[PDB]
Amino acid sequence: AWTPLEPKLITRLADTVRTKGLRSPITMAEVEALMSSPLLPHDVTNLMRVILGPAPYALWMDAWGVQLQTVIAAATRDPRHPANGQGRGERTNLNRLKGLADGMVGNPQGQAALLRPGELVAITASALQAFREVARLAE
Amino acid sequence: PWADIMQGPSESFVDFANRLIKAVEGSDLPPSARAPVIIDCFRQKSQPDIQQLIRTAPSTLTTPGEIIKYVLDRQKTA
Amino acid sequence: AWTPLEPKLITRLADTVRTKGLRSPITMAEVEALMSSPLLPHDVTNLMRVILGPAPYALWMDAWGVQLQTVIAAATRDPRHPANGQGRGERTNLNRLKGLADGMVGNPQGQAALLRPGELVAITASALQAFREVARLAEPWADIMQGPSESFVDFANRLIKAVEGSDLPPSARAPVIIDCFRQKSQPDIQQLIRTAPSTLTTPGEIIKYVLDRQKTA
Amino acid sequence: AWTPLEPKLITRLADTVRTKGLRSPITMAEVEALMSSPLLPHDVTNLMRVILGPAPYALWMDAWGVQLQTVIAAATRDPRHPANGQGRGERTNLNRLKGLADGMVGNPQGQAALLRPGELVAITASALQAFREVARLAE
Amino acid sequence: PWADIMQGPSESFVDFANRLIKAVEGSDLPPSARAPVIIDCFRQKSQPDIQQLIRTAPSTLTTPGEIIKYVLDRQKTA
Amino acid sequence: PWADIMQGPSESFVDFANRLIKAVEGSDLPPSARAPVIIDCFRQKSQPDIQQLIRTAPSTLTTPGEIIKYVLDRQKTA
Amino acid sequence: AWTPLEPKLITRLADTVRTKGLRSPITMAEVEALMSSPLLPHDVTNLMRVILGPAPYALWMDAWGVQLQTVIAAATRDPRHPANGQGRGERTNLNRLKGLADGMVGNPQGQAALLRPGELVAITASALQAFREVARLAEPWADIMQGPSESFVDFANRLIKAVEGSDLPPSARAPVIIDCFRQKSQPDIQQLIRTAPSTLTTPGEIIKYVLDRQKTA
Amino acid sequence: AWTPLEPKLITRLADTVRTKGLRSPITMAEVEALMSSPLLPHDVTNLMRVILGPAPYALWMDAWGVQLQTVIAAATRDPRHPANGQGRGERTNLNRLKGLADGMVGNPQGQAALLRPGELVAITASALQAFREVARLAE
Amino acid sequence: PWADIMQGPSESFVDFANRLIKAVEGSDLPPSARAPVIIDCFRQKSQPDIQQLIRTAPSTLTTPGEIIKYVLDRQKTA
Amino acid sequence: AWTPLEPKLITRLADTVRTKGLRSPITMAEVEALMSSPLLPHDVTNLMRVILGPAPYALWMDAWGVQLQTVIAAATRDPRHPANGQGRGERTNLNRLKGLADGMVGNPQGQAALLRPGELVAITASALQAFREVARLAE
């Protein structure tokens, strides 16, 4: 069952990003805090939509896609990925990682249903690395 | 209106990109038509210094994020 | 049986040569078209008399004679020429090639009677090569610069035209065109080609790259 | 037996390209007209040599090669290509498509002898698509 | 009249040769006297630059076509 | 000191690369840390024209020799 | 038994490379001289370490690897390579060519023991080609003009140097040199070459003709 | 067995030609010195490539060809040439003199194998006369 | 004395050639040394206009008569 | 037996050439008059030495040599030349025509001894044509 993040925490994090900036160690610590439980693509996408401005959000979408593509290359380079399965029918496509696959587009409940925990942690680590890249790039 | 957005003579590029992406995504366009429109608005708006900077790109930029990164790298510091 | 070429086609070809010139690729294509069936010496001679002026016609007669002489040297160097025969009595003299032999002077019917198909195709190829020589002779790449106001496609057209219509070997045109794109083509495009993350190894690829990344103005 | 295209039609088409340009719908209609019967590589090559200038001709050679390479990739991806055969001995190489194979270089008669009708129509469609690309690129 | 034909100061050589050969072949001369007359008119008409170009020919030119080819090869591009 | 080496405004690139590789290999770094340091010093030193030349590399350069070859190919002749 | 190259010859070659550069014909001749006997990977590696600077040495390592890889592709394309054997157990791996195989790393004696003469000559030719590539890379013909005050032999020297030390095929240098003599080489010499009663079909003949008939000044 | 000339002697001769010029009697004496043993076409060709500039090298190639052609005319005028043999199968072609014959192109070892001593001395004398001509012509 | 003969600034070329050939043939030279001396005196005397006229001879002139004919053909009428 | 031409006639002809020029019809008639009997190379050579200036004499020597060479080409093209004989031992060399052969150099008596009448008339016609050429060339 999907539970959304508190809008109070999200508002506090957005104001933190607004006053301290993207690169302060306190901001990265707060992001790591709100990045503790494995989030669904819907959660991370809406979170970055709210806390980041338009241009940093575009940059972050780009960087997240690139990092997810590196993850999928490593996944096709190793059939023992915690997102993959043993047979070929469990291979994870980027539509399933970005939340674009069938039964997931716009629906967080179905998303949480079909996604694997390894998928969730890989998406989360990818999003964190992308946030770091964009923060280092913006300023 | 997205088609009326110009980069002011004194405005920075990240502010212009923010305003343009905001107005394009918060509009009546289909979701599959936002990225090409944002790119072609970066190319035709964004006063002729950045226009020529994007035009003379040895690589082909096929995403608003890539265009923003390229312009932020090679922009005229002033 | 001899059938003459249509004077309508000949008139159209003559006007083509008159407006486009001798060296245009459309003119050479039209000549190749009217040079499709093997022609008798009478046909080619009258054709060149009509389409060419007096001085180009003199030049063409000279060049045709020289090429036919080269053909006859190759023929005496190989008894298996499609114009020759196996015995010595079928050896082909230049009087038979130029239409000057006995029973042929001024008579196209007798010409078509005694001539061989190999003779006809050899005469035709010789006449085509002679036309090419005279066209190259009747009418400088290293002096071509891209003007300050000229576009790049016009400069590329002019340069490729002057390089391909010159005295260079066929295997030396592409490197010369590339190195002229790099050193001519005023320093904005020079730097645009210099800072190419990929290696461009063909004039078409250079043209495509420059057209993509050119400064719209 | 190979029959050449009329130089009168070719001259009219060249003047059409000269006055109207490469991208006008009348020019594309005229090209489609002269692209009606399946042409041999010799025919299309000489046609583009005559109607196009030097730089558009270079661009068109590039684009034609790329499109023919895509066709050959689809052909090795499906052994039922109208240019291919059933056995491996009928596989069509790019030397046979561009007219560079043995018994074809410079000779249109031999070309017409060895080429397949599927080969001809594939070459023709490839050349038409390449012309469209170059026309969209030149202006 | 063939004997009144001169190469103009600004005229090219192929035009002069065309005009001269036309006027000589369309005249009252015998057929066996046209080539020598055309040659000797190339040598004495055809203003002194081309006159000296034909005079200093290391080879002997014995045909109007050969003279035309030689002059077209070694002519002063201008 | 390797971390203080900059490419001078008038210095060529091969001299800068020679000086940098000399100072990096003749230093206290482990042997397995010289190539990444040389690459990242090529990218951040080597005044912004070559910086942008290396940045806009359609291929990924993963060796000092490859970076040197690429820069020598596409450098601004001056 | 392995014998090292003299450090005196190596010092002289290093100073030659230091003063004349990498691309001078004297330097390439000296390298060919010290590349006479088939060298072991150790010898060539140390030689290039000593005579080349750090950055040219990196470039040369890259180029040597690429050329050796081409050699190994040709070797797997032909089982009759003088480095290969008849059975599959003699196939030569790049670890054996670069001296990285077992029993060879750092030991020139063992290297000389296990290596084949065909292996040695292939390694040597590969290293020579790599040196040529790097020399051509470390340091434009179509931009060369004869200055208003420059003599013709200096212009010819500069032009032939820039054309032969370029990326053109070997069969395209003479026509390019001729056509550059004709279009460059300021209009006095241009007209001198144009009005040549003989046909000049070689750069040497053009140079001789121009030197004979040049305007002494 | 072929032995190359010392690059030290060649460097000294090149610097002599660079400082004294082509026509000084000391330079001609040095050339005669390095022209003592009969050289293979490879040796003389590389020697003139190194000691002479580009334009003098072109002139020297021309002059060497002309002198070798005179030698071959004298050889066909006398079947007792030290380069020729008694039968017609030993007649020496210019491809064998210039090093262009089969088994010689680029290979000095094979060159030294197939060449005659009379061939070598004729090539050497021809090259010396050509050097004299070019030196008299350059200045 | 033959080696002191110069073509005067106003003198024609046939007079200079007559004087030079007279002084060379009526001197103490061997008979086999007169033609080369006459040629080399035509080339070095005979004031620089004719010197350049002889220098730029597309053909090789190997006889005093041929040099005289060439110069008389291509001389500057004045 | 050789008889020299009168110096009075030669002086009158020289003054005629001096006043009327080389090309006047009276001068050519006078030359034809003094060219009536077949002259030996000595006679014609001295005659042209006396009547012509230095530069016209050089031109005339050139033209006479060229015309004699044409005559010798026609002679080797026809063994029935009045200067030639039937066997190969009577073939006439240019040394015999120009008076340079053995037993003739400087001696007019020996010249008249060994020369043929056909040789004399050929030399005379050649000299007359050369005089015509030089006269047409001088003015």
UniProtKB/Swiss-Prot annotation, chains C, G:
It is found in: Virion. Residues 42-50, 103-114 are annotated as: Involved in capsid protein dimerization. Homodimer. Homomultimer. Homohexamer. The record marks 167, 179 as: Involved in capsid protein dimerization upon acidification. It comes from the Viruses. It comes from Rous sarcoma virus subgroup C (strain Prague). Self-associates to form the irregular polyhedron core composed of hexamers and pentamers, that encapsulates the genomic RNA-nucleocapsid complex. Assembles as a tube in vitro. Binds to inositol hexakisphosphate (IP6), which allows the assembly of the polyhedral capsid. The chain holds residues 249 to 468 of 701 of the full protein. This is Capsid protein p27, alternate cleaved 1.
